[PDB]
């Protein structure tokens, strides 16, 4: 190619979007923004496929051009805006607030949150280093730069950001024993506590996580997001509570529900 | 099988099960060791030293009495041959055949046997170079 | 030359069992042959066997009980994962009810069922049924 791609073929769209195969030749190509294209949930999908507010592309445009949707406290009119993990989606007309979390099957789920709980997001620190003028600055995986961060904050940390004031109100150090959520790979959406961190020089670092029921899983450092200090996450979790179920137990639940 | 013939002989010596000296052996260990040293001093090779210690002395097997092998004992006292004995004998055979062919040109059979002898020499020299009992650049011509 | 002592042991045992002999002598002896013979004895396919020490490669005298149909080696010792045990047993065993494939595993020398029980793969030594 002689430049950037503008189109996303529907077959080549992320599989967690759960787009259907015959809905068209194309999928919404996510715009550049805070989250990666392959790891985000675009606004058009949230509005039409998930919340059912809109029925068409044009209806999503109509809703967004009314300035009805705020992402993390700010009005977005781009339909392909890449909304991502832990983002607050608020509609200050119906009075509903949503935190974009992962279910245990790797798919973004709009989790309803309280009005007070929609006043902060959780960000993962990507790096800490000196900017111009020798001023220390923090950057996250959701594209934010924060200057003069707390010196106790290091890379891979989780900071609590107040959307109203745009400051770090609290932070969590990436340590063994902190409850985490996996945001990438086959364990996406799984919640557990870190048991040990296995480091290997020159290559990716492996984190060993054990969930509440005792199942153990391992994932790379880049796919781990701390959500609480200790065994108590700072945000509310979806109904699964991050506890992945085997297909046999899912069938048990379905059989019990049908029997009732 | 013979390496360079179809002969399938199985004639060989059979060492006794008892690895300790028979009670009738009374020669002290140092005695047999210095006997070996004199034997190598005239120029005998370990095979001949063993033969003489077997048939002219009350020593059935050196290893049973002393606890070591003849070549090891000679190496300990610095009398081991430079070229290993089997290679020495093969080279002697090769030079004898080469002299005979320098007198006899029509002897094609002896030429074939010389080819076999030199093949054996190359095999054994390769093994000795790999085991570092020969100079790394040791060459036969 | 002697390339596989296990093959000679198993082939001599097979020939002796076919001949109706009640004793077969194995030479040379080896730890792998004694370990294969222990598996064979555990499954009841042979009786007593005796290692004879001759200050060399040993000898084994095995009692035969007429329960052997065939024992053989697989050469080469192909790498067999736990998942390929089914294919190997289909290839080599008379039925899914009887017969054993002997594997060399880092957990030890064992039959394929015991290898499944510990989920350990390895290399195939042979078979007997």
């Amino acid at each position: 190619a002689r430049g950037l791609k503008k189109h996303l073929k529907r077959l080549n769209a992320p599989s967690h979007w759960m787009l259907d195969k015959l809905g068209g030749a194309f999928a919404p190509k996510p715009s550049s923004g805070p989250h990666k294209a392959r790891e985000c949930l675009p606004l058009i999908l949230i509005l039409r496929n998930r919340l059912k507010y809109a029925l068409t592309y044009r209806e999503v445009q109509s809703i967004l051009m009314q300035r009805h949707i705020m992402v993390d406290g700010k009005v977005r009119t781009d339909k392909t805006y890449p909304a991502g993990f832990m983002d607050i989606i608020s509609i200050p007309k119906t009075g509903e607030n949503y935190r974009l979390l992962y279910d245990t099957k790797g798919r973004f789920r709009l989790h309803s949150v309280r009005d007070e709980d929609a006043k902060f997001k959780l960000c993962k620190v990507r790096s800490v280093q000196f900017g111009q003028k020798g001023i220390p600055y923090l950057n996250t995986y959701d594209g934010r730069t924060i200057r003069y961060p707390d010196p106790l904050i290091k890379a891979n940390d989780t900071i609590k950001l107040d959307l109203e004031t745009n400051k770090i109100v609290d932070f969590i150090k990436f340590d063994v024993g902190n409850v985490v959520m996996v945001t990438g790979g086959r364990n996406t959406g799984r919640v557990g506590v870190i048991k040990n961190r296995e480091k290997h020089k020159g290559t990716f670092e492996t984190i060993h996580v054990e969930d509440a029921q005792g199942h153990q899983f391992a994932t790379r450092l880049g796919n781990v997001f701390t959500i609480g200090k200790g065994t108590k996450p700072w945000v509310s979790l979806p109904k699964g509570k991050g506890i992945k179920l085997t297909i046999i137990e899912e069938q048990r639940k379905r059989d019990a529900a049908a029997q009732a | 099988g013979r390496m360079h013939s179809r002969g399938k002989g199985i004639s060989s010596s059979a060492l006794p099960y008892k690895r300790t000296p028979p009670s009738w052996v009374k020669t002290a260990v140092a005695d047999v060791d210095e006997l070996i040293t004199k034997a190598a001093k005239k120029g005998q090779m370990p095979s001949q030293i063993g033969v003489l210690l077997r048939d002219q002395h009350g020593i059935p097997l050196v290893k049973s009495v002393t606890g070591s092998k003849i070549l090891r004992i000679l190496k300990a006292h610095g009398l081991a041959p430079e070229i290993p004995e089997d290679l020495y004998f093969l080279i002697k055979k090769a030079v004898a055949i080469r002299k005979h062919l320098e007198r006899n040109r029509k002897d094609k059979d002896s030429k074939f046997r010389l080819i076999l002898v030199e093949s054996r020499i190359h095999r054994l020299a390769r093994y000795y170079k790999r085991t570092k009992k020969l100079p790394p650049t040791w060459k036969y011509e | 030359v002697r390339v596989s002592v296990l093959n000679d042991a198993l082939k001599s045992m097979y020939n002796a069992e076919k001949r109706g002999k009640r004793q077969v002598m194995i030479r040379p002896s080896s730890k792998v042959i004694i370990k294969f013979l222990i598996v064979m004895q555990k499954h009841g396919y042979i009786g007593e066997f005796e290692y004879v020490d001759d200050h060399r490669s040993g000898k084994i005298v095995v009692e035969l009980n007429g329960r052997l149909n065939k024992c053989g080696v697989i050469s080469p010792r192909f790498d067999v994962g736990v998942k390929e045990i089914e294919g190997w047993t289909a290839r080599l065993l008379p039925s899914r009810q009887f017969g054993y494939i002997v594997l060399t595993t880092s957990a030890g020398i064992m039959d394929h069922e015991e290898a499944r029980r510990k989920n350990v793969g390895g290399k195939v030594l042979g078979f007997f049924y």
Partner: protein, 184 residues
Amino acid sequence: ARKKIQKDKGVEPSEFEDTVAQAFFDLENGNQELKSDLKDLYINTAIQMDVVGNRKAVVIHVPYRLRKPFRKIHVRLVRELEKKFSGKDVVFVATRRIVRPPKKGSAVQRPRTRTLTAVHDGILEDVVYPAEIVGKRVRYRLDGAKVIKIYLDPKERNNTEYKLETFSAVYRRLCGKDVVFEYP
């Protein structure tokens, strides 16, 4: 009164070991053959264990370089020490170091005389020293038992006739292998 026995490291000698040491001290200059060789005698450890033959047996450890001088005086000492403790078949077995097998992350040559096998064969040779080993046979029974059969020399039969079961028990405890003895 603390010279004949020397623990490898400064261990407290068990009471039976001190009794054996006292017996050695009282037997130093008893006889002409009891002296002129007992000067270079040193014992590591002596323990006493019961045997099935209704008697009892005592083993004697040795620093392994006076082993042969010990062998030369083995028969006489066996008599004397047995007289010192009648009903206690006395066996004189040297002390050998069994080393753990080398790992892949090691380049040690691990002398084969320090491996467990060679140690056990040396031990079995030392425990029946008045007799000589003519043949070794190992039986693998159906239940997995590994019973070892050793053929002793037909000569010295009476010299090693009633020590067979005590030898079996000694090799059972200090080595851990089932053992029976026969005569060609």
